[PDB]
Amino acid sequence: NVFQLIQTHQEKAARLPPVEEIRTVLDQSTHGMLSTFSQKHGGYPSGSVVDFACDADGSPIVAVSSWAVHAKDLIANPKCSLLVAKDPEDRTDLVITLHGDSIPVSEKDVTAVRTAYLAKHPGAFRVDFGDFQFMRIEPKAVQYVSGVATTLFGSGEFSKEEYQTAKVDPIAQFSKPVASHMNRDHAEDTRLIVQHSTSIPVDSAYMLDVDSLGFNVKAVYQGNTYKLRIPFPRRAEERKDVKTLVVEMLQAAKSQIKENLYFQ
Amino acid sequence: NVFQLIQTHQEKAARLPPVEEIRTVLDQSTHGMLSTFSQKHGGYPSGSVVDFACDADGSPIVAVSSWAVHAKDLIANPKCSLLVAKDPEDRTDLVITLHGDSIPVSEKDVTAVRTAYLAKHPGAFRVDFGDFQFMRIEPKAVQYVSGVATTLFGSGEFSKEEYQTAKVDPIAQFSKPVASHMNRDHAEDTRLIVQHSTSIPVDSAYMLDVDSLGFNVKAVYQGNTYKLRIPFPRRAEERKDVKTLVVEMLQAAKSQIKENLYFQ
């Protein structure tokens, strides 16, 4: 395993600041693991898998059925936690915990909240949203742990005010269409860019997520899978800048290969 | 989507009884989401991702660090829940919740428990297991919900005694080597078997898990991904019977294709 050899470079690779990384990942996430605690449940705290959509302040909105085992606890027992694992398998990868208080969405805000929720679960309400109670989890504390995004600096916490005032990275929303496209039509271009960036001649590089400062890949080299941070040459300021920076990176990789051949 | 068309057949497909399915899935699982509750944490219940290994009675053994944010709660606050999602993404797939009480593993049992834990996380103790406290989660209740394995009958619960007296399916332990092999060397054979079994001419079928009564696939047909239950012609009684039954299924698929061609 040669990840240990580029540990230092990977540590230095341009990334969002932690609070913006946590704000962005939560904003882009659609499901997580809710921990609740109710009277009438033997004194056992409970876990459930829930869908949610962050509102503009980063408060998860959950559509809670009174029939949903454990998740129904939110109705009446406001204190909860929501756990979001950027990649559920990878135990070195970023895990975010939000402690907060579930607040019913007031009649006035239902339409505005229902709209916002559908802009992350397109294909809900297929029967009826009248079968559910919209709850907003107002955060009290946001904690994270990581061995991939960062190990030494891979733990931290934020107040409600720090989290709420953090900006969602405006490029991150284009992750699935950009990655989709690269991985379908340009997989060998991602491979060449990753080799140039990291100096590991990877078998393959599958693009995972993008932000204004670069993109993350899952790469394979000699049997082993590596999560790698691939920084852009400079910050992307608009959606169009992502293609420009990817092409520039590919041209720089190809230039390096040609010059090396000139020098034998 | 043509899954709705084979709903009835898929409901009837031979499967383990629910308590044996839950006992087996938990026995074969290596990580889950722990819900804990501590004093000195604002009255917020907390979630964490933990590794575990079920003991022979099906009690999850967890190696708990006093430094692990939230999971350290187990040390001192025995009442917890462990959530295991057979496939974390798929919100129709089986989700198991165990409510139980964390009990420290006595000095006497440490070696016997440490051994048992390593037989599910081979490559722990790489530094030291002296850095951790082994806790056993004694179950009080085991609950499940499913939309794949079963929807109408896709919810239930078991007592400690019902869960503990259930048998782990003895073929399930061979899931990863059998699936590995089929998916690497015999993927088109899995495809043909799935088409014969379900009458959907699937693009591909990736074998997921096996038990004494059959195997589960993730299949693709015209853009859409389907989880399908593929029952054996009869129960497998030993590891060797799995290859025999798979070959028999492939021969039956090929015979059906030939006879159809004889009849034009």
Ligand code: NI
């Ligand atoms: Ni319960």
Ligand code: NI
């Ligand atoms: Ni293109």
Ligand code: NI
């Ligand atoms: Ni906390």
Ligand code: NI
């Ligand atoms: Ni073979």
